[PDB]
């Protein structure tokens, strides 16, 4: 019944936040449907290499937003307690809901 | 089979056939070809008075064509050529009222581009 989405720019750590949760949650309760990866939406940007009227000569840059999704079963007090308390995203965005 | 302005289309499907007349494009044509009967597909070939004559009645009683239609144009052109507006200004100057291109193109509106002389060019090399 739990809808936890994790939006991330560093896919390395962002995934590390995806399985971690699942351990202690599969631990402090019952099943926790696997972290399931979700379409890393990417915002395409680009511009030219310099300042002066140089139509060619360009560099592309884009935003890598990886989506994560954890579903847990019927929650428990330990689970909810620690796994709403402890964290260290240091940036990464954590948004949950009751669907 | 003169209808208006001595205009007879001859062998050709009635739609495009009457389309061959000024004052009538695809719309006003097919429109007429319902509001006076007449099958759009069926050619001008085996036509028959009543419906041809009445097509012609639909032409004039409803809207105008040819001479007056262009007289209207030119007279309101005179409306642009009675004060001296930009429209009329460049209507005289041989130029379009769209303020777009007067630098290069617009040769649709003042004959072939008749060479100046080149005037000799800057440091182009």
């Amino acid at each position: 019944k739990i809808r936890i989405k994790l939006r991330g720019f560093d896919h390395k750590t962002l995934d590390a936040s995806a399985q971690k949760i699942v351990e202690a949650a599969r631990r402090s309760g019952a099943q926790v449907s696997g972290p399931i990866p979700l379409p890393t939406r990417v915002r395409r940007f680009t511009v030219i290499r310099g300042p002066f009227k140089h139509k060619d000569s360009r560099e592309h840059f884009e935003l890598r937003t990886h989506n994560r999704l954890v579903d847990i079963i019927n929650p428990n007090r330990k689970t909810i307690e620690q796994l709403m308390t402890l964290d260290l995203p240091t940036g990464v965005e954590i948004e949950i809901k009751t669907v | 089979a003169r209808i208006a302005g001595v205009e007879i289309p001859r062998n050709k499907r009635v739609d495009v056939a009457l389309t061959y007349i000024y004052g009538i494009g695809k719309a006003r044509a097919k429109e007429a070809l319902e509001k006076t009967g007449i099958n759009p597909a069926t050619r001008v070939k085996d036509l028959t008075e009543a419906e041809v004559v009445r097509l012609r009645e639909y032409v004039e009683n409803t809207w105008k064509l040819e001479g007056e239609l262009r007289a209207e144009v030119a007279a309101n052109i005179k409306r642009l050529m009675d004060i001296g507006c930009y429209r009329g200004l460049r209507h005289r100057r041989g130029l379009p009222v769209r303020g777009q291109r007067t630098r290069t193109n617009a040769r649709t509106r003042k004959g072939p581009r008749k060479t100046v002389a080149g005037k000799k060019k800057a440091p182009r090399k």
């Binding site: 139509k55 060619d56 000569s57 360009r58 592309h60 | -």
Partner: protein
């Protein structure tokens, strides 16, 4: 019961189920010979069943999403290949020399900044 293969070509993909029966084939709904009433490559894609002349013994059921009509066709071929090269890899012996597994290439390449179709370049002046 199930003799399945995977198809995928020119950015498209076909879930190639093949059971047996009368060897008649229909895919993604509509009858095969109406789904693709365009390109002649149609029957050509069904070459592997015509490689052993067993065109009508194995019942295929394919799910091809993406690419185009022809791309679909490509992935279909790919799978009909892979499926008979599973539930009888005896058919693999005489199908690679025939080239029924080399997947694909093709990509309308990443458009080159500066040129058009990543190759197509603007008319060069010099002057």
């Amino acid at each position: 019961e199930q003799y399945y293969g995977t198809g995928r070509r020119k950015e498209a993909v076909a879930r190639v189920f093949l059971r047996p029966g009368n060897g008649k084939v229909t895919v993604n709904g509509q009858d095969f010979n109406e789904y693709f009433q365009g390109l002649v490559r149609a029957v050509a894609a069904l070459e592997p069943l015509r490689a052993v002349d067993a065109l009508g013994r194995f019942d295929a059921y394919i799910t091809v999403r993406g690419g185009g009509k022809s791309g679909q066709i490509d992935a279909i071929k790919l799978g009909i290949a892979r499926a008979l090269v599973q539930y009888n890899p005896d058919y693999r012996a005489k199908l690679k020399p025939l080239g029924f597994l080399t997947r694909d290439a093709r990509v309308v390449e990443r458009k080159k900044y500066g040129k058009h179709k990543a190759r197509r370049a603007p008319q060069y002046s010099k002057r």
